[PDB]
Amino acid sequence: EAYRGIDKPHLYTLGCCSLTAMASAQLDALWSQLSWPQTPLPVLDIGCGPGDIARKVLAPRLPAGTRLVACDISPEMVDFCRQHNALPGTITYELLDVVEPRLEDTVVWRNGPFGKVFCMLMLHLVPDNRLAVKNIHKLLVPGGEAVFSVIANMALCDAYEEMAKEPRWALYMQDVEKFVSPYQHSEDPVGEFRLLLESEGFQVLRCDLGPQKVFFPTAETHREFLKSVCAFLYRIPEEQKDDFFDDWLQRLEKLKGTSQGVGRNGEAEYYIHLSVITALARKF
Amino acid sequence: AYRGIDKPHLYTLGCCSLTAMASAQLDALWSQLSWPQTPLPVLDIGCGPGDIARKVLAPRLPAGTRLVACDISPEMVDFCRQHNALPGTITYELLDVVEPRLEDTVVWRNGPFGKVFCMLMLHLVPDNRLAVKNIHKLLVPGGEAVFSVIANMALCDAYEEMAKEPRWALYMQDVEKFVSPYQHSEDPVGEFRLLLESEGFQVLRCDLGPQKVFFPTAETHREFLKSVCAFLYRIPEEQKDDFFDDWLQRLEKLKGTSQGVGRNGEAEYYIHLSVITALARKF
Ligand SMILES: C[S@@+](CC[C@H](N)C(=O)[O-])C[C@H]1O[C@@H](n2cnc3c(N)ncnc32)[C@H](O)[C@@H]1O
Ligand SMILES: C[S@@+](CC[C@H](N)C(=O)[O-])C[C@H]1O[C@@H](n2cnc3c(N)ncnc32)[C@H](O)[C@@H]1O
Numbered sequence A: 001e002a003y004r005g006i007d008k009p010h011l012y013t014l015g016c017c018s019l020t021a022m023a024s025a026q027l028d029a030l031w032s033q034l035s036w037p038q039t040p041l042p043v044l045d046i047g048c049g050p051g052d053i054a055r056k057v058l059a060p061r062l063p064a065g066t067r068l069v070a071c072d073i074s075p076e077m078v079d080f081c082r083q084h085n086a087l088p089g090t091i092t093y094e095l096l097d098v099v100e101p102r103l104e105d106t107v108v109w110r111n112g113p114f115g116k117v118f119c120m121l122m123l124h125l126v127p128d129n130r131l132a133v134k135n136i137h138k139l140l141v142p143g144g145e146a147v148f149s150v151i152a153n154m155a156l157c158d159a160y161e162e163m164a165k166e167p168r169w170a171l172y173m174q175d176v177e178k179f180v181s182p183y184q185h186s187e188d189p190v191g192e193f194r195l196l197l198e199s200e201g202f203q204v205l206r207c208d209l210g211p212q213k214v215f216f217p218t219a220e221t222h223r224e225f226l227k228s229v230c231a232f233l234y235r236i237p238e239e240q241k242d243d244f245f246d247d248w249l250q251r252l253e254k255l256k257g258t259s260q261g262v263g264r265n266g267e268a269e270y271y272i273h274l275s276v277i278t279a280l281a282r283k284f
Numbered sequence B: 001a002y003r004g005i006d007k008p009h010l011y012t013l014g015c016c017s018l019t020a021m022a023s024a025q026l027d028a029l030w031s032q033l034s035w036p037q038t039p040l041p042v043l044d045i046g047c048g049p050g051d052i053a054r055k056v057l058a059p060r061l062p063a064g065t066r067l068v069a070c071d072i073s074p075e076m077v078d079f080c081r082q083h084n085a086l087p088g089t090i091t092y093e094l095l096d097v098v099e100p101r102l103e104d105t106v107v108w109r110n111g112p113f114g115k116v117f118c119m120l121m122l123h124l125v126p127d128n129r130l131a132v133k134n135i136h137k138l139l140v141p142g143g144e145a146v147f148s149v150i151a152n153m154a155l156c157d158a159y160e161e162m163a164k165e166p167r168w169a170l171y172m173q174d175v176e177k178f179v180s181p182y183q184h185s186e187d188p189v190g191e192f193r194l195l196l197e198s199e200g201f202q203v204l205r206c207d208l209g210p211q212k213v214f215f216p217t218a219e220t221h222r223e224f225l226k227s228v229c230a231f232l233y234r235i236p237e238e239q240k241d242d243f244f245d246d247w248l249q250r251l252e253k254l255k256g257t258s259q260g261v262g263r264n265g266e267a268e269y270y271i272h273l274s275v276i277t278a279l280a281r282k283f
């Protein structure tokens, strides 16, 4: 987040084998409610990450001849996409900031207009949500749909706000509220997100909130994945990087955002808990 | 004996890469696949942890078709029903592809199957003609079988070199049954095409090519090779960790495993092996 997005894309694909199945289950619940034009239009994926939802989930489910455009503010992610999950003739991985001042000067804008825009687990990394909904509203054809997978609240955000009070850190965390989801302290996340979408010319067709778990088979891939989604590590020097992490990870099982379980085969299971708002809108 | 691959937790470390690989192979063949008007059940033999079924097969299947995935090991068949469980579509059962009494299995009576997928497993089945004959039984006349057999790989040569060690020879007396039969084949595509046609199949397409399995971290590359090591279940604990290091060291000797660099500067870990891809049809 902030300066670029999630660097180190290698550590993030450790959650592919789990995050792929999660969004693949969310989209299956909404895919029947999605209407499509006769002649296909380009489809956009915002905050595509290492391009696994774009390649392994979105692309197999799109109609034939539908071209896909996947963007991410972090370069390292978009280069990881074009090298591993690179799907020729369908997916075109590009760079874009969803709250770009000059959207009309980007490659993604001129690939448009787009029929559908999938914005998955990335709108919590955007402090200015209404500006991001605006730019998505510019990119959609009238009648085009948008699919949101916004994270309402999670213990990772509170662990950020608790660490921001440490004079040890503090200096690097003066803007902690801009690294926290805007629906973190919201008493009604579904209502505020339904109001925000409709306040930008959208027809909210469906909007629900539920808990989610992120499965990890091994112990270290649970740890190494949390290294990537730690948004403050790019500001900390090396002598305190490994200390910011342990301070963070300790404050997580305190807040019970992460957990460890047992398997039917007896093996150890590792989890990450968080709430997700799922939305389906349509431009007028 | 070999009750397939246990420790399913370690195998899903290759899902994030094996999913994209088998997804790429099917895209090269999916145009040549005919489908019936009324859907018939589709079978995935040796499905593993249900990843090349929930995320690869079922998404692109004709709506209304039902998938049946079967492994030989309960641990995998148990991993699927928990994680990659897709109700109303994929059913995960247990089956040995060379079962003496196929007709007494649940998989046999969910059939007959329109299509049968077989990805990276026939190199674990010594009697390959028996497994092809069983696949021929399960298919409807006109059905199609999609094979993904590993012709040769350095994991097998490392096995045959470790069998010569008196340190291990007691556990590795049947080393030729833990090696793909097409390992020492001078023409794997020819033998496989002849094997399929000798069982009533019409080989529509058959190619051989090298493939690569990528792992982003160092230990996921290591922990995955723990699962695909077929001799670890025979070794006592005092020599298990020594058997793995002896295996891993011989792998970079034979250059089956490699390591690379990333555009962002990160380390890349690989596993190299040859794959036969086939598309047959029952008469
Ligand atoms: C935690 S990831 C989730 C990726 C994807 N939803 C998935 O589940 O595979 C959020 C992604 O959105 C990117 N991102 C963060 N902030 C962004 C912004 N303001 N504009 C565009 N992309 C952003 C990040 O670089 C990161 O790759
Ligand atoms: C390494 S996996 C590959 C699974 C899938 N193709 C993939 O790439 O994810 C091969 C699976 O087939 C199972 N298997 C091994 N021998 C078998 C046999 N003779 N019959 C049926 N299944 C077998 C093993 O338990 C193993 O889980």
Ligand SMILES: C=Cc1ccc(O)cc1
Binding pocket: B120, B124, B150, B155, B227, B228, B229, B230
């Ligand atoms: C048990 C041997 C083995 C070889 C290749 C593979 O993909 C899985 C297992």
